[PDB]
Design a protein around this ligand. Structure first.
Ligand SMILES: Nc1ncnc2c1ncn2[C@H]1C[C@H](O)[C@@H](COP(=O)(O)OP(=O)(O)OP(=O)(O)O)O1
Ligand SMILES: Nc1ncnc2c1ncn2[C@H]1C[C@H](O)[C@@H](COP(=O)(O)OP(=O)(O)OP(=O)(O)O)O1
Ligand SMILES: Nc1ncnc2c1ncn2[C@H]1C[C@H](O)[C@@H](COP(=O)(O)OP(=O)(O)OP(=O)(O)O)O1
Ligand SMILES: Nc1ncnc2c1ncn2[C@H]1C[C@H](O)[C@@H](COP(=O)(O)OP(=O)(O)OP(=O)(O)O)O1
Ligand SMILES: Nc1ncnc2c1ncn2[C@H]1C[C@H](O)[C@@H](COP(=O)(O)OP(=O)(O)OP(=O)(O)O)O1
Ligand SMILES: Nc1ncnc2c1ncn2[C@H]1C[C@H](O)[C@@H](COP(=O)(O)OP(=O)(O)OP(=O)(O)O)O1
Ligand SMILES: [Li+]
Ligand SMILES: [Li+]
Ligand SMILES: [Li+]
Ligand SMILES: [Li+]
Ligand SMILES: [Li+]
Ligand SMILES: [Li+]
Ligand SMILES: [Li+]
Ligand SMILES: [Li+]
Ligand SMILES: [Li+]
Ligand SMILES: [Li+]
Ligand SMILES: [Li+]
Ligand SMILES: [Li+]
Ligand SMILES: [Zn+2]
Ligand SMILES: [Zn+2]
Ligand SMILES: [Zn+2]
Ligand SMILES: [Zn+2]
Ligand SMILES: [Zn+2]
Ligand SMILES: [Zn+2]
Lengths: 173, 173, 173, 173, 173, 173
């Protein structure tokens, strides 16, 4: 069950996202994690967040989906509290090092990472989603991202900078 | 949660299989279910199984993965007994009519359907799998299909006919 | 010429539609037949059509394009009366069992199947068509579907239910 | 019916080949005609054929499939003598200028073009065909190409040069 | 370095364009050159240009990107004067016959070819471009095409016919 | 010219590699950089290299191709010394921060990164390359990787560990 080998971790590029949504091509988790990392780096800096917080978000961004090399990627609406609890235990056996990073993340780093994780998905569908369901999913995710941010521990000035940058970025995507 | 609308059921063709395996293109559950149906029809007849059994297998083949329109398709090795139990309850809320069919299936119809479900996957990867992991998965599934068949309630003569037809078919695929 | 083997019938998923229309990916006849079957099942029931009629439409939906495993799929505008006559004889040698089903279909079952066959194509292009020609084809097919339905032997109440369901479905596709 | 507009002729790149054969991607008739043109140019010269013959083959290579913008591309085994006769009349209404070129082609130019037309297909499948059926088709076409060449009016020395070049090319493809 | 073999020239269909722009699929230089050839042929004739000029543009259209089999296709904005100078020398060693054709082209043939080369790209992105950057590139190329044409040695009546045909064609693409 | 915006850096996933090589799909530079990062992390650790060296290689791996968002990705054989010199100056204007990182990299970190950069490409083609040219490129890159490693400043024990891990990984890819 545990992932221990580089040949397995390289299969990040074999793991397809958007398994219930029509898209122009199958996005893999390697390109997704790179893009989330980029957003954490750039937007954490734009928002003036402490370097240690941005570093922690970026480190997690690069590995956060490695368990999917075994579990697959599953749709957000399907991940109810009971399923998430079961998956957290399974994921901790698959990638104990990722579980340890997750358990060490500061709340501000977690909220930066989560904002960027969802933003990347909205940005991806803006270009590559196909049809009415994909459009609805893109807009639902955007609403969920905003609600989570607004309710988070991040200072309002940080929230506003993140939304400023998100909106500038999606307009040009 | 429950799937009630034709526009949702049409998204069978938006649901991608093989989410952790490299393939030439993303196979959807609509083409998969059609092919499983075909195998049930043809091989059930070749094996001389009663018409009522073949009909029941075929009826289930056409709908068996509809819950994945919500849950996504998840990899076989990941579906442990505890996860399957949780998924069975969720799937019964998503598609109660499919759950009722599943609960009514005779053992012989279930074993025909399961043989054909796994055979279709082996046949798909034979053409469309890419790389060493996909090759291993193709061969693992073939071993699992044979072991399940050999341990099933199907008469040995039926088992032998199913394996005869499978091997003729894969040679020409 | 005659198709007799399961390995050949499995090549339904190797037969590409839309050979003269730009699309996001090459749809195969297996996913098409599954979707037409689904529409026959759901919309035949919604329209209150007799069970025997819906069953006959569904049975034909699952096999109606098997001859294309040999002939290929050819564009609707190209199928003039003289070509259709030649193709009907060739198709009857390729898949005599499908030709027998076609010759037994009741008019009401044929009109349900034909409505759903064309509706599926409109629905597919709505999501997956690319460019001005594909858009024109989508709209032409929709006009042809409506004209055929309006001129058919189906009761007006059945026609209206089919159009009600079609329009609800395309809005959400 | 007649193709008269550049916007229609540009849809050569919207016309997919190999509609009954599994391939890595859908090859269009524009890339096919370019490659056939190239083979006519290079191999006609290598074989020492008269410039006027090579020019005529090349001119036809660039337009020979334009009718498929309306008819679609249909599989070689399906094109029986009776269907070809019907298609020739339809194609002459679609693209009268191509029909006139075809009717003017010298036998030696026709045989060069036909050798290159089939060679291009073998070469394409060598790289891009998937599965056992595609492999059989690749090899069948190669046998058909050789038989037609050997029975043609081309001088044996020209036949041998064409086969020399074909075999060198496929080894490196 | 020099391209001398047919097996190499056939790799035109292995050379992908739009390497910095999101598209629905990777267009190759073989389909691009065929389409540019078509535009030169049709629009040169529509504009009443001398046959010798149209022939020269068409001949160059079919080979103009062969050096990319070695160099790759590189984005227009990246090709500054200093890079173009270096690339011209490299390209002349790769395909001396193409360099000789380029050096012999009459100004009117060059301007026809260049108009059609850029028009083909605009037309391709109109159907197959994805996202805001691709949209901007499509429109930038269209502006560049018009500016080059307006400043060229082509007679105003020829310029107007080329723009007339371009605009009719893109509306139907 | 300079890349300054997150919306531009996100287009890493719009930049296609392998522009002169046939592949099953167009790999982008985001998934490539993630995989190179992974190899630097895992194999640098396996080889016992100092943490500061592995960190520097990993940091560069994540950004090393950002200039390609403007320049495109160009084939290795095409990058002669004179072209590389011109490209280095252009790349330093496009991404000055990447140029600064490159100029600060220690030789041991550079050699780790370069080994992993080439290894990733070999590993990618092992799964996703198509045809004889792609096969030759895969094997050429592997020979080049080994020659560079053997001639590098890395200790022989580090070289041997890198080759040990590479060979174990490719066997399972
Ligand atoms: N509403 C939706 N419908 C369908 N797919 C969706 C929807 N929202 C997101 N997706 C997709 C995007 C991914 O492919 C997949 C799961 O997203 P992912 O980013 O891995 O995790 P997550 O943010 O949902 O949860 P977690 O952090 O608990 O793993 O679901
Ligand atoms: N060993 C494997 N590794 C990776 N993917 C696999 C493996 N075996 C099968 N798959 C894929 C095929 C499908 O995309 C997915 C799940 O298969 P699926 O046919 O829906 O269900 P299943 O037979 O595993 O279980 P169930 O009937 O309980 O739903 O896993
Ligand atoms: N106007 C059109 N232009 C181009 N392609 C079209 C058009 N209308 C439909 N198509 C495509 C859809 C399919 O790929 C193909 C043929 O459709 P198909 O559903 O197999 O048969 P059909 O309904 O035309 O006739 P039949 O029932 O006589 O076989 O043509
Ligand atoms: N044995 C085969 N099985 C399936 N597809 C095949 C076979 N041989 C060739 N093909 C494909 C290649 C093309 O996509 C299509 C028709 O080929 P094409 O090159 O247009 O014409 P053709 O040479 O058969 O005849 P014609 O010159 O009379 O039009 O059939
Ligand atoms: N603004 C742009 N941004 C990104 N890609 C572009 C842009 N304009 C064009 N392209 C793409 C189209 C091709 O894939 C590539 C180069 O175009 P190409 O037609 O080969 O040459 P070119 O007209 O730029 O120059 P030349 O004739 O000097 O070779 O750049
Ligand atoms: N022999 C080859 N033939 C064709 N493509 C190749 C070959 N070797 C590598 N490639 C491809 C892989 C990439 O798509 C592209 C350039 O590789 P890339 O990894 O960006 O840079 P590089 O290692 O060649 O040089 P640099 O570090 O100077 O930029 O060439
Ligand atoms: Li999807
Ligand atoms: Li995920
Ligand atoms: Li997969
Ligand atoms: Li599944
Ligand atoms: Li098409
Ligand atoms: Li069809
Ligand atoms: Li095909
Ligand atoms: Li054809
Ligand atoms: Li691109
Ligand atoms: Li180019
Ligand atoms: Li490539
Ligand atoms: Li590169
Ligand atoms: Zn994520
Ligand atoms: Zn199944
Ligand atoms: Zn149909
Ligand atoms: Zn042809
Ligand atoms: Zn060009
Ligand atoms: Zn790199």
């Amino acid at each position: 069950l545990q992932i221990t080998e580089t040949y397995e971790r390289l299969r990040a590029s074999h793991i397809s996202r958007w398994g219930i949504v029509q898209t122009t091509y199958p996005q893999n988790i390697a390109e997704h994690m790179w893009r989330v990392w980029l957003l954490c780096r750039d937007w954490g800096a734009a928002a003036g967040m402490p370097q240690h917080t941005v570093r922690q978000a970026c480190e997690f961004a690069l590995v956060h989906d490695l368990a999917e090399i075994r579990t697959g990627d599953a749709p957000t609406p399907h991940k109810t509290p009971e399923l998430k609890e079961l998956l957290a235990g399974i994921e901790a056996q698959i990638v104990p090092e990722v579980a340890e990073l997750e358990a060490t993340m500061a709340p501000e780093a977690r909220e930066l990472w989560k904002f960027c994780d969802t933003a990347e998905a909205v940005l991806f569908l803006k270009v590559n989603g196909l049809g009415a369901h994909a459009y609805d999913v893109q807009h639902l995710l955007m609403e969920q991202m905003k609600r989570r941010l607004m309710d988070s521990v991040l200072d309002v000035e940080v929230q506003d900078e993140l939304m400023f940058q998100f909106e500038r970025t999606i307009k040009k995507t």
